[PDB]
Symmetry: C3
Subunit: 149 residues, 3 copies
Amino acid sequence: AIEVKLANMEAEINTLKSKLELTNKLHAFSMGKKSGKKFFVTNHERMPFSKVKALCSELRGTVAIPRNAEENKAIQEVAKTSAFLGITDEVTEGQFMYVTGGRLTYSNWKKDEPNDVGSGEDCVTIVDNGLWNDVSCQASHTAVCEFPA
Amino acid sequence: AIEVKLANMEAEINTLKSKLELTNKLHAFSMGKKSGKKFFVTNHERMPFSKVKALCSELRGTVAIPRNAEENKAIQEVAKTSAFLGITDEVTEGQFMYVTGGRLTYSNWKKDEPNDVGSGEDCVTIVDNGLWNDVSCQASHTAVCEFPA
Amino acid sequence: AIEVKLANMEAEINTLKSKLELTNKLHAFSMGKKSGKKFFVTNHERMPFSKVKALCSELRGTVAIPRNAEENKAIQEVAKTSAFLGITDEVTEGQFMYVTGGRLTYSNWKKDEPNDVGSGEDCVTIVDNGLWNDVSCQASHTAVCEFPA
Ligand SMILES: OC[C@H]1O[C@H](O[C@@H]2[C@H](O)[C@@H](O)O[C@H](CO)[C@H]2O)[C@@H](O)[C@@H](O)[C@@H]1O
Ligand SMILES: OC[C@H]1O[C@H](O[C@@H]2[C@H](O)[C@@H](O)O[C@H](CO)[C@H]2O)[C@@H](O)[C@@H](O)[C@@H]1O
Ligand SMILES: OC[C@H]1O[C@H](O[C@@H]2[C@H](O)[C@@H](O)O[C@H](CO)[C@H]2O)[C@@H](O)[C@@H](O)[C@@H]1O
Ligand SMILES: [Ca+2]
Ligand SMILES: [Ca+2]
Ligand SMILES: [Ca+2]
Ligand SMILES: [Ca+2]
Ligand SMILES: [Ca+2]
Ligand SMILES: [Ca+2]
Ligand SMILES: [Ca+2]
Ligand SMILES: [Ca+2]
Ligand SMILES: [Ca+2]
Ligand SMILES: [Cl-]
Ligand SMILES: [Cl-]
Ligand SMILES: [Cl-]
């Protein structure tokens, strides 16, 4: 009977795993995830870049990254205020790279930016109208995470 | 060892079932579900009717169907823009049925609607008024899913 | 082999426990939970105090309790209307206590409140502007639950 109980339990587990996946899909849906698109979410908390990266990492997501105008607008409507994007030029000044790998393709810089102000600005925030401004990674901005499509 | 381990994993499984049930109750509450009332949810995406049904079906819900004046208003409250209802006359033109089966009971059609205008209209949408209008199941309108009371 | 399958089941269970914890963390985050702080949620339903206690209790939370001005404003923003707080003087008239134990410290009473009006008022509501007013526990106000930091 032991092997039977085990098989029945593996069946329960398979069912439970599917149920949890459904819970995740309904949650993503209720928070705006569009079909076939990445899911963007925020708690409206402002913190230094390293903390945003750590936070999204803990949720198994990454710092929000706009790969085109549509995604940029999506992030813009989720944030409501200045928010960090998963982009920095920490390696080579002026060479923005995604924190998940690869050179920046789509960009939406504000007039006169990036300007690597004062002691330097190697992080990026999306601001008003959805435009971009480089800022200090130590500055506190809104944490917005993204999850895969 | 073996039998005690198996017995404990059965209890772990049941504990996980209880927690997931609790998680689902909390999510429904946060989504606005009122006690002993069905609730509606949307990701604010606009799409063809066939996609709305498939999407809600996957989430184990159905395309929102107002059974009375109250519910019809709750959906309107959630949608905010034209949204598909789980009603169509695809089977027999003129005869609208619920996607869940059965013939129409309560309704709230707009004046001189449904009319099956143009090349035809077999789906139904709730407008920024609560009134209903048949439209092309191919047109794109907001997806609003409904879940059991 | 039996022992192999059992060890796999343990791994599956531990994986499921991890994923559910992540689902809970992401949901809290999506609900505005700030790092190291408790969060608040409401379904916007109005009901007597005993019903709110039972509802929050079931979700493994408690009726919202503002411990300082920051928390008070967060609860105010979530409520958007009059809502019960986890504070009452049901046990000893005039001495407000937290439903979870302990005498009231931080408070935000409107002028001339609390006043135990009429036959008496032993519960507390936060109002539109964030100030507090004692009311009848039998009155119906918005249900707002709080969850631990
Ligand atoms: O050093 C931060 C930032 O300062 C300046 O931009 C300002 C900020 O974006 C924020 O305060 O909003 C202001 C009004 O829109 C804006 O001037 C610039 O020097 C910018 O380059 C710099 O990163
Ligand atoms: O074919 C769609 C629909 O078109 C006409 O109604 C219009 C639509 O409901 C929508 O575009 O909003 C318009 C006003 O805001 C409205 O006139 C009608 O021909 C209707 O019968 C038809 O279903
Ligand atoms: O705002 C004061 C008081 O208002 C409500 O009670 C009412 C007042 O005592 C007064 O208007 O008389 C009414 C009965 O005639 C009574 O309901 C309550 O909200 C109370 O809690 C509050 O202190
Ligand atoms: Ca630099
Ligand atoms: Ca720089
Ligand atoms: Ca700058
Ligand atoms: Ca037809
Ligand atoms: Ca038709
Ligand atoms: Ca029509
Ligand atoms: Ca009393
Ligand atoms: Ca009293
Ligand atoms: Ca009072
Ligand atoms: Cl920097
Ligand atoms: Cl059609
Ligand atoms: Cl009372």
